[PDB]
Enzyme design. Sequence first.
Site, short mmCIF file in Angstrom:
data_model
loop_
_atom_site.label_atom_id
_atom_site.label_comp_id
_atom_site.label_asym_id
_atom_site.label_seq_id
_atom_site.Cartn_x
_atom_site.Cartn_y
_atom_site.Cartn_z
N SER B 204 -34.17 -13.75 1.86
CA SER B 204 -34.05 -13.29 3.23
C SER B 204 -35.30 -13.63 4.10
O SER B 204 -36.42 -13.73 3.59
CB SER B 204 -33.77 -11.78 3.24
N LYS B 226 -29.72 1.70 1.08
CA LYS B 226 -29.74 1.40 2.54
C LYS B 226 -28.41 0.80 3.04
O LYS B 226 -27.98 1.10 4.16
CB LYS B 226 -30.93 0.50 2.93
C1 HEC Z 1 -23.78 -18.09 13.55
C2 HEC Z 1 -24.70 -17.30 12.58
C3 HEC Z 1 -24.05 -16.40 11.52
C4 HEC Z 1 -22.80 -15.80 11.48
C5 HEC Z 1 -21.70 -15.86 12.51
C6 HEC Z 1 -22.72 -15.05 10.24
N1 HEC Z 1 -23.90 -15.25 9.51
FE1 HEC Z 1 -24.43 -14.27 7.83
N2 HEC Z 1 -26.33 -14.89 8.05
C7 HEC Z 1 -26.77 -15.87 8.93
C8 HEC Z 1 -28.18 -16.06 8.72
C9 HEC Z 1 -29.04 -17.06 9.45
C10 HEC Z 1 -28.57 -15.22 7.72
C11 HEC Z 1 -30.02 -15.07 7.19
C12 HEC Z 1 -30.70 -13.83 7.86
C13 HEC Z 1 -32.05 -13.60 7.49
O1 HEC Z 1 -32.47 -13.80 6.33
O2 HEC Z 1 -32.82 -13.08 8.32
C14 HEC Z 1 -27.41 -14.51 7.28
C15 HEC Z 1 -27.45 -13.45 6.38
C16 HEC Z 1 -26.28 -12.84 5.93
C17 HEC Z 1 -26.20 -11.86 4.84
C18 HEC Z 1 -27.32 -11.20 4.01
C19 HEC Z 1 -28.60 -10.75 4.79
C20 HEC Z 1 -28.33 -10.04 5.97
O3 HEC Z 1 -28.62 -10.53 7.06
O4 HEC Z 1 -27.78 -8.94 5.94
C21 HEC Z 1 -24.88 -11.63 4.58
C22 HEC Z 1 -24.35 -10.71 3.52
C23 HEC Z 1 -24.07 -12.37 5.56
N3 HEC Z 1 -24.96 -13.18 6.21
C24 HEC Z 1 -22.69 -12.47 5.47
C25 HEC Z 1 -22.02 -12.86 6.61
C26 HEC Z 1 -20.62 -12.58 6.83
C27 HEC Z 1 -19.71 -11.85 5.85
C28 HEC Z 1 -20.29 -13.14 8.02
C29 HEC Z 1 -18.94 -13.01 8.72
C30 HEC Z 1 -17.84 -13.84 8.01
C31 HEC Z 1 -21.49 -13.79 8.56
N4 HEC Z 1 -22.54 -13.56 7.69
C32 HEC Z 1 -21.57 -14.33 9.85
C33 HEC Z 1 -26.04 -16.53 9.91
C34 HEC Z 1 -24.77 -15.95 10.32
C1 LIG Z 2 -30.32 -11.48 0.29
O1 LIG Z 2 -29.66 -10.74 1.32
C2 LIG Z 2 -28.49 -10.03 0.98
C3 LIG Z 2 -28.33 -8.65 1.56
O2 LIG Z 2 -29.46 -8.01 2.07
C4 LIG Z 2 -29.43 -7.75 3.47
C5 LIG Z 2 -27.06 -7.86 1.32
O3 LIG Z 2 -27.02 -6.68 1.71
C6 LIG Z 2 -25.87 -8.48 0.63
C7 LIG Z 2 -24.59 -7.63 0.38
C8 LIG Z 2 -23.30 -8.28 0.92
C9 LIG Z 2 -21.96 -7.88 0.69
C10 LIG Z 2 -21.59 -6.58 -0.01
C11 LIG Z 2 -20.84 -8.74 1.28
C12 LIG Z 2 -20.19 -9.61 0.19
C13 LIG Z 2 -19.19 -10.61 0.80
C14 LIG Z 2 -18.01 -11.03 0.14
C15 LIG Z 2 -17.12 -12.04 0.81
C16 LIG Z 2 -17.59 -10.52 -1.23
C17 LIG Z 2 -26.01 -9.91 0.14
C18 LIG Z 2 -24.89 -10.60 -0.60
C19 LIG Z 2 -27.28 -10.70 0.39
O4 LIG Z 2 -27.35 -11.89 -0.03
#
Ligand code: HEC
Ligand SMILES: COC1=C(OC)C(=O)C(C/C=C(\C)CCC=C(C)C)=C(C)C1=O
Lengths: 89, 378, 378, 60, 48, 75, 53, 49, 49
Positions: B204, B226
């Site tokens: 992250s 959390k």
């Molecule tokens: C257009 C940008 C974008 C969209 C839309 C998005 N993601 Fe992400 N997502 C990211 C990025 C970039 C990170 C990394 C965040 C970080 O580490 O600060 C991330 C992190 C996350 C994380 C783990 C860390 C966290 O931020 O909580 C999860 C779980 C997640 N995404 C799942 C999803 C799901 C499920 C969807 C809806 C299908 C989705 N994301 C839609 C860009 C996005």
């Molecule tokens: C390193 O950051 C991560 C988090 O820290 C903010 C999470 O909280 C979660 C928990 C996500 C869940 C329960 C959604 C799973 C989605 C599907 C389609 C089964 C993941 C995976 C993650 O990688």
Amino acid sequence: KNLLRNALVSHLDGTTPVCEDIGRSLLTYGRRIPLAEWESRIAEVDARVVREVCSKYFYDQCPAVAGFGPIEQLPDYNRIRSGMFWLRF
Amino acid sequence: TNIRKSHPLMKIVNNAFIDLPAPSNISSWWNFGSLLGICLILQILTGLFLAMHYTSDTTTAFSSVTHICRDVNYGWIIRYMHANGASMFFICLYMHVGRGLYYGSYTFLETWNIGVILLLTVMATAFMGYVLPWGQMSFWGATVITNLLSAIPYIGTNLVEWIWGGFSVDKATLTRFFAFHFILPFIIMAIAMVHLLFLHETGSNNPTGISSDVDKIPFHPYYTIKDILGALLLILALMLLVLFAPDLLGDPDNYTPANPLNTPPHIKPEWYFLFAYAILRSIPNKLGGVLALAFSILILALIPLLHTSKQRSMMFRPLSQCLFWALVADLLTLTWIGGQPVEHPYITIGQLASVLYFLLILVLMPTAGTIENKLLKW
Amino acid sequence: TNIRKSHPLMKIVNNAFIDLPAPSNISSWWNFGSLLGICLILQILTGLFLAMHYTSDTTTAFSSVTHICRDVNYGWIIRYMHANGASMFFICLYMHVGRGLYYGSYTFLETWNIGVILLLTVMATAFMGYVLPWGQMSFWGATVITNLLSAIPYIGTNLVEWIWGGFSVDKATLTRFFAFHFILPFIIMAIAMVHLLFLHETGSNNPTGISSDVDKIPFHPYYTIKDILGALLLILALMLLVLFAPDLLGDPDNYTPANPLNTPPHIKPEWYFLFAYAILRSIPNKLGGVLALAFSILILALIPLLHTSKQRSMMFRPLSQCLFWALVADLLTLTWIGGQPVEHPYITIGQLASVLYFLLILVLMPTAGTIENKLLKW
Amino acid sequence: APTLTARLYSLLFRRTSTFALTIVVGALFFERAFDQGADAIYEHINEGKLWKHIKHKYEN
Amino acid sequence: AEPEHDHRKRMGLKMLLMMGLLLPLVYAMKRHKWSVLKSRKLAYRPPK
Amino acid sequence: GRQFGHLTRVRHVITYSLSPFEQRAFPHYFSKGIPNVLRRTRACILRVAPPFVAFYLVYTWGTQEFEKSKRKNPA
Amino acid sequence: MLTRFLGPRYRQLARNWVPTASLWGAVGAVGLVWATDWRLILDWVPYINGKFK
Amino acid sequence: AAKNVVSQFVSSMSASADVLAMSKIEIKLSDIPEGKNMAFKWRGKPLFV
Amino acid sequence: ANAGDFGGYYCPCHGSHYDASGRIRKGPAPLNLEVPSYEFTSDDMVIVG
Ligand code: HEC
Ligand SMILES: COC1=C(OC)C(=O)C(C/C=C(\C)CCC=C(C)C)=C(C)C1=O
Ligand code: HEC
Ligand code: HEC
Ligand code: HEC
Ligand SMILES: C/C=C(C)/C=C/C=C/[C@H](OC)[C@@H](C)[C@@H](OC)[C@@H](C)CCc1oc2c(O)c(OC)cc(OC)c2c(=O)c1C
Ligand SMILES: C/C=C(C)/C=C/C=C/[C@H](OC)[C@@H](C)[C@@H](OC)[C@@H](C)CCc1oc2c(O)c(OC)cc(OC)c2c(=O)c1C
Ligand SMILES: COC1=C(OC)C(=O)C(C/C=C(\C)CCC=C(C)C)=C(C)C1=O
Ligand code: FES
């Protein structure tokens, strides 16, 4: 039990460890506890006693933990605390 | 040697959810990722139990949905959990994107680019879903959004009629929209896994934008707990809406059956489409309006190329903080305009807000980053 | 440093399909694994294009299927590709199980046990699918197979009515069977991945049952090309059936609409259920008959505990070879009996074949393995 | 050692099985006591109004 | 328009009262675990 | 999780191979191919065939017996 | 054939785990009874009574 | 809370208000000749007079 | 109707033989066919339920 009889007897071997034991024991117990008493105390211990006495001190208790050196992989304290009980029991 | 650590299936669970090194550090803005997953399975589960009673024929589609809400034991909670969960899905999406924009998380190119696909896929899924109960908003929603393809020169008309099933929205349109709307959440679920796979490669980001390897904590028990709390807030927010105000975020016009002869006077999108709607209609041109709509969401893929700043996060960047909030408030402005009729003050201020949206991301935020570099002697 | 080898997604593809060490050695009997995958996506793809036009209401379900076959541009190939692909799915399943039984592949406990789940899931999926066109075989198929649950004491009746939607098979039954039949192939697809994940842990078995690490070859180009050929034979076998004999493996009675007042005189299962059908009706007891049916497929999970032989494969085991073929021919006997009415010669020989099925696996094949051990002075 | 959280822990919480047993027994008696209360609050805040309070007007 | 009206408001009161228990309780559960980090003390002790 | 270079230990074994473009895909296809299939058939016929003839006999008898049973004569 | 696990230590190990396995059954019985509202058993329970009289 | 959503979801698959409590059927006796079974519909499942 | 070997009823599903009482005689079925609640109004009509 056997390891402890062997440790106790093998320790009290020489004038020096025996003198230490006389000296130390009179400070701590106020007597010398004779070898035959320890054997009596050892003999009493069975599996039920080990389960009782370990549970009393170990099971679901907060440890003190000390770490020195390359310790990145030393488990977090919550996860060490969680290791102090079992969910299956 | 641990059973949790070496079993080929539990391996995957452990390296994602338990032993995964996570920053000591990440705030409530990091809760939205798990919340999107909760949203995904909530919509899957309710959507399944709605599919058990829904019929996808034009004669009967409205009747089946109301059969759910009146006759089906607890069909009403399932239906409105689904409806308000779709809006919950959008609140979480927007928070999640904005977090990424603010904290410079887009520098994870693959994670971010997959995220952009996930936004477009969940938008297309939810459009389809709204077509299904065959109300007035369902029909014209289906009309307008499918017709966006008709702006592709030479072949656009053939394409619209190809997805319609004929010359107009019809019997053929609704049956395939049920099929498309059923499968696409599972395709989404698969893309959500690839999203997570690319993320775990780096771990992250955090509020500071500084590398946090110096101070990682195990995901369990800290972010398991959390996340539970965060989900329990998501349940509050959802169950406030279904139980005290089930129709607050929807349209009353979708409670009258579809009618191909009359488009209603008032017609607006679902709240979560209103900004993009406002952008497209600010342009009095067919091709340009749809090109702006496509560009309003596809722009997110340019944001990494436009990062000028020597810092990742906006935390220590006050000029950028101001312009980020100008972007949020401008987006809030565009959803307000989307809600209003195409009349005097609203046409111009919506045009200016459209221009500001594109000017902020393209020009003003990259320049802010350079100025901030120069001010730190960088 | 290779792009194929280190990219987090292509990694998965490379370690499964390209660089995967495979025996020099594996025959045509190993082609059925990929063929089951081809079958899975064929059924997914056609099933999707059928779902685009199918309606799941009792009034209209038969009409929609025939609308596909007459009005929908090329709806007929899609419908009968689907129908004959389901039978292709079963030919490949049975070959694949038999290969595993012969070659001692069941000693991969997790791979095999997941395989048993995959058999039961694809059986339940295909039962549901046959209910959908709402012919006579659809209705009574739905009646009998759901009623198997009514043999669970105390709660079985409540359970049958729970999955029905009421006191009889009805409107509620068909709409949920469409929903259950839509999702379950994707659940299957996910379990097929876990099946492959457990397999890659050991790599493949081979005809000899001897470890082949001494002589591995890369999956590409050898088993990529052998799989292509094998798939092209699968296309022949399928396209022979849809284009020259589309209804050979189905029932004519499913071309009359469902009728809750009359069960037809002749009624039999789909060919691929006939052995299990023959087993259940050989027992003139309700609880015992269904317990035998469950046991006829769940037995495969006992086969690893009953392996007595000091060799893995049946290749060097002639007594076991004979008794394997007695098992295949007895299974061929049971599908013949399944096809016949419950009258004089057929009742007894079907009872004897049922007994032989269970005696061969439980008693006769384990004893053959011990004798073979003793003959080699082992 | 007189204290009540202590005896709660000693008798019921120390073992995970007893902990689970005290939760499930706890959940049974909570479901009764909460549904008893929350219905009685909802019924009192809607004094006549519901068909439970109308019932007696139309006969046996 | 809405025959569920009285049932949804009954479940709503249950939802609010349950959440008034569960929200402070899960909060305490999360705080209890985060205790170890939130009260932690760092010292830096470089050589010479 | 198994990779070339990590599989097992082998010593003292030479493998001679030819390029695909140096050699025929169907080297002596009928001349050697037919003798082989017959040899493979001979090897397995006594193991594979006798249960299926045993099916065939019970099939032929069973169909015949069922046919004859639903006829009468002196009644 | 399972004769590996028969001897004085496994007899002691089974004896140790018996109160626990008994309590996990007692957990699961009440949990099934609670989840289904099992009418047969809950009629006995002196205060849990959703059925009048 | 888990009990409640799970039960409510379970309850949606069981018999709805649309299908409860079915009525009697009148059949004239002299309309069937001596030695015949006559196939009527009652409660959705066949009735044999 | 009028099928099987006890002059009453045959179910063609798994070979259940019922007599003209509705009683099970041969095959898998555990119980005799469901007798409904019915009455005769005099001797012209039968009302069932
Ligand atoms: C257009 C940008 C974008 C969209 C839309 C998005 N993601 Fe992400 N997502 C990211 C990025 C970039 C990170 C990394 C965040 C970080 O580490 O600060 C991330 C992190 C996350 C994380 C783990 C860390 C966290 O931020 O909580 C999860 C779980 C997640 N995404 C799942 C999803 C799901 C499920 C969807 C809806 C299908 C989705 N994301 C839609 C860009 C996005
Ligand atoms: C390193 O950051 C991560 C988090 O820290 C903010 C999470 O909280 C979660 C928990 C996500 C869940 C329960 C959604 C799973 C989605 C599907 C389609 C089964 C993941 C995976 C993650 O990688
Ligand atoms: C198993 C099939 C299924 C899945 C999965 C599914 N839904 Fe639906 N959805 C339905 C059906 C059926 C309806 C029609 C009933 C209705 O209108 O509520 C529907 C309705 C909708 C509606 C219209 C709500 C209304 O009534 O106004 C929206 C919006 C929606 N879905 C979005 C989603 C989103 C977002 C997802 C998750 C990506 C999703 N659905 C998952 C089957 C599904
Ligand atoms: C009840 C047993 C069983 C069933 C049913 C089964 N599998 Fe398998 N499968 C196995 C075993 C055991 C192996 C290992 C074979 C070996 O190495 O000799 C295997 C191997 C395979 C292989 C690769 C090697 C090969 O044999 O071709 C694939 C691919 C495959 N399975 C996929 C599937 C698919 C897809 C299905 C249908 C959903 C399925 N299997 C059904 C037990 C089975
Ligand atoms: C996207 C939905 C979908 C998927 C995936 C699906 N099918 Fe179907 N299937 C249908 C529909 C709709 C029908 C009804 C049309 C028809 O009868 O051919 C159907 C019909 C059938 C039938 C009846 C064929 C007939 O007409 O007699 C069978 C058998 C079948 N499916 C088995 C399968 C199997 C096996 C799979 C793969 C595990 C599968 N289907 C995948 C939607 C699907
Ligand atoms: C098989 C073909 C498919 C699935 C094609 C899918 C295309 C999907 C799009 O991209 C994913 C799309 C959903 C996305 O555009 C970027 C949205 C934000 C569009 C927002 C949108 O909503 C409207 C709406 O909701 C209405 O009804 C109440 C009516 C409308 O006119 C009056 C609109 C409208 O004018 C616009 C622009
Ligand atoms: C929601 C609940 C669900 C999905 C329950 C699913 C249960 C599924 C089962 O297990 C997976 C099942 C398919 C499997 O049994 C092991 C089969 C091999 C059963 C074979 C089968 O077929 C019949 C059939 O096809 C008919 O119609 C033409 C009619 C039939 O009677 C006359 C039968 C029949 O008597 C049997 C035993
Ligand atoms: C080590 O043995 C293996 C084979 O050698 C006989 C294969 O031929 C295949 C090819 C399988 C395919 C194309 C089906 C994929 C299934 C899904 C659900 C995508 C795999 C995976 C395998 O592991
Ligand atoms: S359903 Fe009548 S014999 Fe089985």
